[model samples]
Target: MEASPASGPRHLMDPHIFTSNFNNGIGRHKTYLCYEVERLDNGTSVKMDQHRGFLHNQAKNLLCGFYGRHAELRFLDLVPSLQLDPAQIYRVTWFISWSPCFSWGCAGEVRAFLQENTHVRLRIFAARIYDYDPLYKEALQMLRDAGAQVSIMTYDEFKHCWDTFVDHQGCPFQPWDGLDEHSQALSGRLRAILQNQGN
Candidate 1:
């Protein structure tokens, strides 16, 4: 039997709030993540416990403030408790508000985790590139080298997150004013980062 939602931490999944949290706008402080884990067998993929959640960055301690932990780290910590089958292959998909960054050892930890867990595969679709700086660019490349497929989220992905993660009470997803424009700009920047790695 799969683990019940009541057994795990619950997060806000409101669609109206998701629109702003997942936007590519500047000055956005919080990072939200939506994830799914699935098992692979006989060329078929089966969801494990319908495991999905709306996770956000967490404060580790009072001294460290909000920068103490990241959403990715929180998710990584939660993975083992899921008690997934060690013999089986699993795939996890993360839809994040911001791409993983180089600071706070976030990307490095993720790379190491993936390296140690060969039976697992991860794909990340981010709403915005965290930064365009050289270090951040290299971080993205590092994740790619570690067998992670990362990309900037597009329109379809936004819609998918709305349908899959949001508690919208049956309301359809409506695009915000700058959704397409911001997506295009951010995707273009991400393409440059990944494509121009050598230069």
Candidate 2:
């Protein structure tokens, strides 16, 4: 569905409006994705590290941003539902936020994510309603309506949960994991190098 006056996480307020307002603001980094392996099968394990989007500085936030924004995009109806095979690689569309602190999307997307990764259980590790921006109220409600769990978590709880997931998941690395590290690391740099040669 396209943007409508009455249809949104907030009434009549364009999603972009909220994002711009919050862009100049700041808040604690208080929410994250918590997923645990339900069971390990005989085939190659889907180590979080190998995904490249699951661990490290910006990459860590990349996961949170992917899922968090999926919840928002589902709400906005900006993204279509995905019909995907679980065996191949899967990554949510790179979320372009219209709301700074929120990125919610269709429940189908989340359902697809869960369906694709049947071995993982997902959760939102968020600061209590009092400790953070209460903006998630409507977003959380939307997810809950679709049967996803939204929890208020403590700072310590967040760390323990994140550390546990980080530890058990993510293998060192294997060949055939796609582009070489040197090439992946050179992304943007290669283009700049060519541009300078032209200049």
Candidate 3:
């Protein structure tokens, strides 16, 4: 049976769009998130499901556009539909275009969610840091303290996302210019943030 738009396959993101959204540059207004849910038992992890999609900042009121809902909040809103088993151990992995921010309380909400959902483990791999500042660094640390694994995406992760979440029509993933360089730089920055937390 072929998958249709109304079915499950339509959620897969287009490869071109995925690449552009995840690319390291300014003007990346939209945030793309790719997620995988796995059940872990007896040291064996079984993949349950996965999805890839984008989210835009939602306007709160007609005239109050400044107070917008972030993509992280939108993702959190969708988590309940997974019907997570409280007794079971599950790992949820997220590949995001940008790291979670602190300006709008996104980091705090994500941290609180992890603290409340002890059965679920979160792993976030982001393409780039949202904002390079001390507060953002602290926010990332806050998530780590809540038992979330946060890291910048590397080349292997990018390839994995391309193969798993993107609809490339059988085409191999082609790395954009400076892909590795940017990844390495971001990884270094993320590593420093996590390391500085201990000091």
What tens digits encode model 3's per-residue C-alpha lDDT throughout 1-199? 3242221334567777777666667554666666776788887766553433445555556376456666677776777876677788888887777666773397678666767887788887877656545577666767777777877777887776675676654556778788667777777787776674555
The TM-scores of all predictions, comma-separated, are 0.79, 0.31, 0.79
Order by lDDT, highest first: 1, 3, 2
Of candidates 3 and 2, the better by TM-score: 3
Distance from true location, Cα of 29 in model 3, Å: 2.4
Off by over 4 Å in 1: 1-12, 48-50, 64-67, 131-134, 178-180, 197-199
Instruction: Estimate, for each residue in 22-103, the C-alpha lDDT of model 1 and write its tens digit.
Output: 6556454777777888778876766543477767776657485545677788777887788777687888888877666663
Task: State each model's CA lDDT, in order.
Answer: 0.70, 0.34, 0.68
lDDT of 2: 0.34
lDDT of prediction 1: 0.70
Q: Each candidate: how many clashes?
A: 0, 14, 0
Output the better candidate (1/2) by TM-score. 1
Q: How many angstroms is residue 78 displaced in model 2 relative to the true structure, after the best TM-score fit?
A: 20
Better of 2 and 3 by lDDT: 3
Whose lDDT is greatest here? 1
